Amino acid sequence: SGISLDNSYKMDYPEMGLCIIINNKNFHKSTGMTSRSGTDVDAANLRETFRNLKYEVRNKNDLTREEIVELMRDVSKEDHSKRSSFVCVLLSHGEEGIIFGTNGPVDLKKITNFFRGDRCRSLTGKPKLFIIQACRGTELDCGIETDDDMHKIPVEADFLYAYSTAPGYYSWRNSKDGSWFIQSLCAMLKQYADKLEFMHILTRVNRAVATAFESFSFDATFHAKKQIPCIVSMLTKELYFYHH
């Protein structure tokens, strides 16, 4: 028929896909990790936001490092043929390239590897989104006043990592309102998911976290600190949550 363009991901499959939310609040005493007050608000906000985007949401609470790996393995072994995409949200303590299970750390690469183009065939060519609310180190942002050779695709292609903070930095979470990033992400998805492309929505999240939030602490070391999220894209097409 008429001229056809393929610059955007096919999001009109029978299902939008799964949205796995791993909410780790309480950690084993021996790990020495604090309870993540406010993460409950984040998990509920995400569940509602992704439900409205027509995702099959599965909320999992307080999972061990073994349970996280088992869950990710099992989910990657499911038949996603009739699903448009895959979303995984991780809410826990963390360090650079690491997310914490209740009893210990899990390499983010171990989790995401299960969804590689060669390891999860029913998701090949489809967007795989990983939203991570966790620290990526211990740095604090002080802020500032204003020849031709011609059928393969990379195994790391079609992944999007929406990190809550820049590499090497702490990530902030309010005990009453939830995390700065997730609060902003849900607000921007609710307002713009039916209007803007995903990178543009995430850029609005970057602005929201960057401008509307500043830490308050009685400890001078942790007071008046800022945060900027980090969008890491290996996507090959534009992503719209809606379709024609």
């Binding site: 604090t34 993540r36 007050s37 406010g38 826990s92 303590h93 963390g94 609310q133 966790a134 620290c135 809550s164 702490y170 990530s171 902030w172 979470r173 309010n174 005990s175 995390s179 830490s215 308050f216 602490s217 942790f222």
Partner: peptide, 4 residues
């Protein structure tokens, strides 16, 4: 405000 707390850090993760």
């Amino acid at each position: 405000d707390e850090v993760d």
